[PDB]
Amino acid sequence: SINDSKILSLQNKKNTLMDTSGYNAEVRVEGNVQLNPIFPFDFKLGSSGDDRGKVIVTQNENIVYNAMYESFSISFWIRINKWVSNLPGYTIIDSVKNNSGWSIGIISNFLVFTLKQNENSEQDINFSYDISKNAAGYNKWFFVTITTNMMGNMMIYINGKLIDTIKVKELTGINFSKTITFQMNKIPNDNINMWIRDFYIFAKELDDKDINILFNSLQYTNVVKDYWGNDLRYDKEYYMINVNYMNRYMSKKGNGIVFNTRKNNNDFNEGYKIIIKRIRGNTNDTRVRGENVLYFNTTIDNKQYSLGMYKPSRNLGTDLVPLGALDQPMDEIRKYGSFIIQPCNTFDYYASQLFLSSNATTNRLGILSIGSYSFKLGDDYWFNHEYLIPVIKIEHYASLLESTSTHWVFVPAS
């Protein structure tokens, strides 16, 4: 197993941060450090005040290096908020003693891993997130994996995917520090938070196969995630957005839901919010899971509507039915407004696919896509108007299964 090479395993256990690898490294906690009492059992750090938060992990004895050759791998889940593209320099995870060791930091849209041999010798490698795809900041959970071979390459992975590979030329060896300090420290040239969970160190070079297994094993893939990677929940306000139309928010005109262009990318707080409601499922713990039957409520002008099918003023195309906001009872929601959810995560986003349910069962009649169509809504009368609407393709939709126009994300309102 790959756990045979695991020399450190920082985990929250019984509301206490500790090493669970077996090597029993000392873990001291100081300042404002908040531990999550539920999964993923993360710990939260800040960057403001003298009491900001500090986790000192002192590796107990030399034992830990007893099975090491010239390779080691670091892996951890991490979330940063608000990770703006013009963020100033911050060292976040430091393990450098006497100008030797390694250090992880963040600056602008870069997460940089620096490997130090001495004063004069260091090599770094980074992941830079796509600014155009994250205009509101890269504020989502992501899985870092960093592998290093002194006689080979220095590699970095994000969400199981290889981002960059640099050959180790300048560095001959590394005398590692026995201390690792998790603390957000501003580099000498608005406040940000950082969540971390399952910080592992391995005494070997993990390959792509092992990194993807590790990536998936640390997740509950059946549990659908919100836009930031947290567990999607019932009975909670979200902004429902389509992957292909991130600069659109949800609005209403007559029976129909319509998508309008948002004002800016400061945040997603614009338009009407949805609330997800459970109908069927194997578990009942508030979390939304794959194959759950559900429906959507939305409050508009102090009245709640449910998302459901309606007849458009004229036909939009073969096997297409538009999704509108309707004030109707549960029997009608079960017939014409119930959906079977299915998680759909990619490197770029945590999303989902929604299939039209037959009588609130797991039987599928169609898939929820998006598109612009010319017809009449609300007080329209004289002319037809192009409306970007959510639309269900029924019966025949195998080609839409692979389309990103069926990928829906949920941004929490909070």
């Binding site: 007849k311 458009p312 004229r314 036909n315 039915v321 014409y336 009649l365």
Partner: peptide, 15 residues
């Protein structure tokens, strides 16, 4: 299931 599709077409599509 085939009756479900014809029912939806009957209700939500124009004639």
């Amino acid at each position: 299931k085939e009756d479900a599709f014809s029912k939806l077409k009957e209700k939500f599509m124009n004639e």
